[PDB]
Structure formats: structure tokens, C-alpha cells
Amino acid sequence: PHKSSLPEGIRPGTVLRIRGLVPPNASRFHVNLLCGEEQGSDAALHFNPRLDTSEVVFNSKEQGSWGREERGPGVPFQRGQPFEVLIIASDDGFKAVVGDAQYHHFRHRLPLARVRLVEVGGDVQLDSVRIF
Template structure:
């Protein structure tokens, strides 16, 4: 089990063909959580992908990017791939067209706004429990992050 908030470098960075596999669960009393792919290793870094499920009565997932300290325009998907009090598996695939986010099925393709070569870290925060984060297909050896 990984403590939240969580921030870890992605050694070797990412490129087209890399997948990020996240296994976790959301509590019954969830409000929101976020997964950010950062272009640096601090909270103030640019954000290539902001994935933000919100349970606020109008359940939705917000996608966005941040460049130079400013958030860009949000893309809101009004369907929720997570259930309160349930485990989940999420895969973020980096493709030539964007970030393909899957949870059992294809959920959403978020187009690239920043070069994926700039991604250096993954950050997870909010109302979520994370068991595993695996980065599959990284440069050099495939080094999975395993949290038990």
C-alpha cells in the first residue's frame, strides 16, 4: 500500500507505447482524487496529464494540462469509471494521439498538449488507496513499481 499523497520519478521517462498500470480502491466517502503526469518532480511542475475523478453529485472525470503555472481548458467526461467503496484497475497508455485511459473498456483519449518526452514523475493525491503502480515499457529495463 502506497501512502497518499504520492510522488515518484519515472526513471527513463515515457514515450509512445508506454503504459501506466494503477491498481487501487476508492473509499465510500470519496470526494475526488487526482493522478498527474508531471514534467518535473515537484508540485509546481507542468502537468502533461491531469486525471481527476470527482464525486460531487454530478459525477464526472476532468482531464486537463498545466503549462507555466496556468491550467488549460478542462475536458469533462460525464461518466464515472469508479464505484464508491470498490477496487479498480486503471491503465494509461501513451499513444501517438494522446493518453488512452482505460478502466475495463476504453474510457477516454486525451490529446497530448505537452511533449510526452518531458514527463518525469507521477503524482497521486486525494481520496484514493493505491496498491500498485507499474510503468510498462520504460526505456532501458522495464522497472515496475510494486507497492504491497
């Protein structure tokens, strides 16, 4: 599970670029925006491609409890294939970009200013995480 601290926190205009490879046998993987380095910290954003059930789940976690799932059938990832994801913080939410198209817009639940790090876990080969 990769972790990268956000160099100047996050505001509208912060961009995370995540390049990686989905393993041939992958079940799921996730990208989290967390509000602290301690285990169980609140997640302002949880981006969760599920290859074994062909869906994507978006959610947040507050006080060890998950929120309302923003989910849907289909997944813009394929086992064995490389990807490039953008997570873009906007004034009213996070835009999740996969490949050449915005896949979802996740409206803010937690205060944007509380986000401290990015976590990448689950079944994924991470090539790079860049923060612009």
C-alpha cells in the same frame, strides 16, 4: 500523495497501471503526469475522477495555469469499490483505460518527452503503481 519517477521517461508504448480502492467517503482523486519534481511543475496529463459530482475531468497545467477542460458527466468509479486504471502513452495522446474499456483519449498538449513522474493524490487508497 504518491509519487513515482518514470524509469526511462516516456514514449509511445509507456504504460502505467494503477490499482487502488476508492474510499467510501471519497470526493475526488487524481492521477498526474508531471514534468518535474518541484512543486507546481507542469502537468502533461491530469486525470480527475470526481465522485461527489459524478464526472471526470481531464486537463493539463502549464506555467501554473490549467488548460481547457475535457470533461463529461458520469464516472467509471464507485465509492467503496476497487479499480484498475491504465494510462497508455500513444503517438498522438494518452489513452485512459478503466476496468475493461478505454474511457478517454487525451490528445497531447505538452511535449511527451517532458514527462518525468507520476503523481497520485486526492481521496484514494493506492494498492500499486507499475510502469511497463
